[PDB]
Design a protein around this ligand. Structure first.
Ligand code: NAG
Ligand code: NAG
Ligand code: NAG
Lengths: 166, 224, 224, 224
């Protein structure tokens, strides 16, 4: 359950929090992706990488030597925590989107976070953030030691993770 | 065949702004239609009891009886009797509680120690600890607040008071608030209202932004 | 009369560097011919109890037995049984001693918080607090060493472990060392030592003095 | 045929947390049916020994016998006798090993020298060295923990203890840990833990970080 992801603040800190809004990163990396007009959403910048990535003293991937089964469990836990934190972020009505009985726009946010995770494992990210690049490279290394086939196999389980969180 | 009379801890008075008398029985043989009453020094019945528990399956009764009394009456320190009417006992079993006398009041000192710099480096979580020292009696109620709004009791916990190593007659309580490192590295207040009898106004608070330790006269910055 | 179990704790075995099994028979009358022996399931164990506690103010003994067992044997999870044979007991009774099982181990994160600025300004004392957070199971031993030398147990007091605010299974404990502002201003590094099962080395040490917080690159000093 | 039983080195004591022994032997007749055994002056039951080495083709057969011994018993220095019987030699190979006594315990001084700037300037490696000097018992066990997680013995190489040049009784040792200069610049606080008998808790830490050792380059003296 506990993974080291804090409550979402991408569109503003939760009340009583006031500031902390994350702006759209309309920039591209020369080394990775070269020219890309896509702008990274605040939510994606705040994606709950979970145990896949620790920010201690810069950025260091936590899956340097992780088995395929372990990586699947880590991603499942990360998606579950992302769903939980997104629900508590939109339920309090702090997300700009959120200002059935689910919080308005929560399903959009969780589906889009799942899409971002899919593209993180697949390695086809439109724009690579700080956490995106190293995680993409390491996940490519782990599986190929073909990534698309792996995710096309475990997507049902990963989405079952979101359903179980809900 | 005794009765456990729980006095209202000062946290209880401060939380609900009323003095609540709760006496819990124990080690009483099983039978129905058992009644309890609360009586003060003069013996007059104070208030009928509510939220009475059903017969205890564990063979030892634990019935909760609530009686309301004037705050000043409890502050004076009279002996309030909880009379338990039990069929087996020829006379009702009586237990009484009075607040301790003496207990030289000493104002608490509320110092907030912000998170260690080596904890913020983890960039995961931080624990703002609101140290409270040099107070008596051993009853405080530390409550946290962010930006002036109360925080849910899930986020903070208060260690039980313990004797202070230096002063024998004083105690110290130690409370922490688990804050997210982003919310700390961004300027946030996280006050700490400390409720105690020895305080003049019965509550004091100290805040810790990220900028408390900052010099406030030279915003010295390092940039590549 | 009743036999009670006192398993050794990490606070005990680490301090004494030996696993001391203790038996307890609470409030037994002052009689003669106290016999205590220790046995595992196989039963070949034979240890002799020494220095039985003297009569307490209640005028009734409390049987206490001292036994020496290898750390590996205790860590094996084998249940330890202590024989009790005494005149007051109508028949000998055996008490069962074993450690809790099925609990995960998480290494603590010893964060050493220097005393608050407000407290040093009083020029009365400083309480360097050792925050031992995120650990499990709830059994931690905190030692305070100054300039590489142990400090007297009187100076510091260690808070009992409490459940962590947010993390479900983890705990947190605090140890405060009270020292004069002059000593703190001089700087002796006041190392905090934590002993816990989950630590890879079984011990971790942290250090703090007046110079830890001050920035290293720039020495901006305001003068009049 | 004489068995060269080896005492459990302190590195074995602290790395495995258990006292494991062996009875390596110089042998004349390559193979015999009977296996190793261990005896004590107390004459307690021998421990189980398994996984004996296969016949050595060059006739210098060496056999290993594993036994579990209490740390306190080995700490006391009581002699343990390896008893090995073979068909060729009816007389048991009675040889005794005990930890040497009479040697004063001297606390190691651990000094973590950062990498030479001549090395970081290459931006290819950063060999952090844990200089352990001044410990009188030859035994020592240096372990490296990076960013709070212990590192495998592959990464670092610990030099064998050697006599100190100046002080004859004392010894010294080295333990270099090599990490790519990318990791060093992040400031990961590479910590060295030395395990030695003389230490107050048998382990002391010294942490080196990219910032440590950097003097105050800028000394701004704002005076009004
Ligand atoms: C200087 O002031 C700004 C206010 O916008 C603050 O964000 C910054 O942290 C200050 N400098 C340092 C070194 O803290
Ligand atoms: C850092 O500044 C303080 C402020 O007066 C001064 O006392 C100290 O000497 C300075 N450090 C060094 C290394 O000079
Ligand atoms: C730093 O500046 C202060 C300003 O008075 C001075 O006293 C001190 O000697 C200086 N230290 C160094 C190392 O230059």
């Amino acid at each position: 359950y506990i993974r080291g992801c804090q409550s979402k603040t991408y569109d503003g800190k939760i009340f009583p929090g006031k500031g902390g809004e994350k702006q759209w990163i309309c920039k591209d990396t020369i080394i990775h992706g070269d020219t890309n007009g896509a702008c990274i959403p605040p939510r994606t910048q705040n994606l709950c990488v979970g145990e896949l990535w620790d920010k201690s003293y810069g950025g260091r991937s936590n899956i340097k030597n992780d088995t395929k089964e372990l990586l699947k469990e880590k991603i499942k836990n990360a998606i579950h925590k992302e769903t939980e934190l997104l629900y508590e972020y939109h339920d309090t009505g702090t997300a700009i989107i959120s200002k059935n009985g689910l919080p308005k726009g929560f399903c959009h946010a969780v589906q889009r976070s799942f899409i971002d995770y899919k593209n993180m494992i697949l390695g086809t990210s439109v724009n690579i953030y700080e956490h995106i690049g190293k995680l993409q490279e390491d996940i490519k290394k782990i599986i190929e030691k073909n990534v698309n086939a792996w995710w096309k196999g475990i997507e049902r389980e990963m989405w079952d993770a979101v359903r179980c969180a809900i | 065949i005794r009765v456990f009379a729980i006095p209202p801890s000062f946290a209880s008075i401060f939380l609900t702004k009323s003095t609540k008398l709760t006496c819990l029985v124990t080690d009483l043989t099983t039978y129905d239609s058992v009644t309890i009453s609360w009586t003060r020094q003069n013996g007059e019945a104070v208030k009928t009891h509510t939220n009475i528990s059903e017969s205890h399956p564990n063979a030892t009764f634990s019935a909760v009886g609530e009686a309301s009394i004037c705050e000043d009456d409890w502050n004076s320190g009279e002996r309030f009797t909880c009379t338990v009417t039990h069929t087996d006992l020829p006379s009702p079993l009586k237990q009484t509680i009075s607040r301790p006398k003496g207990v030289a009041l000493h104002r608490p000192d509320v110092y907030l120690l912000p998170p260690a710099r080596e904890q913020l480096n983890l960039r995961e979580s931080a624990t703002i600890t609101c140290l409270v020292t040099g107070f008596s009696p051993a009853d405080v109620f530390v409550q946290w607040m962010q930006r002036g709004q109360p925080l849910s009791p899930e986020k903070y916990v208060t260690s039980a008071p313990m004797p202070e190593p230096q002063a024998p007659g004083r105690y110290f309580a130690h409370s922490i608030l688990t804050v997210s490192e982003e919310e700390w590295n961004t300027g946030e207040t996280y006050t700490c209202v400390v409720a105690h009898e020895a305080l003049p106004n019965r509550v004091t608070e100290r805040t810790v932004d990220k900028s408390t330790g900052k010099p406030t006269l030279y915003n010295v910055s390092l940039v590549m």
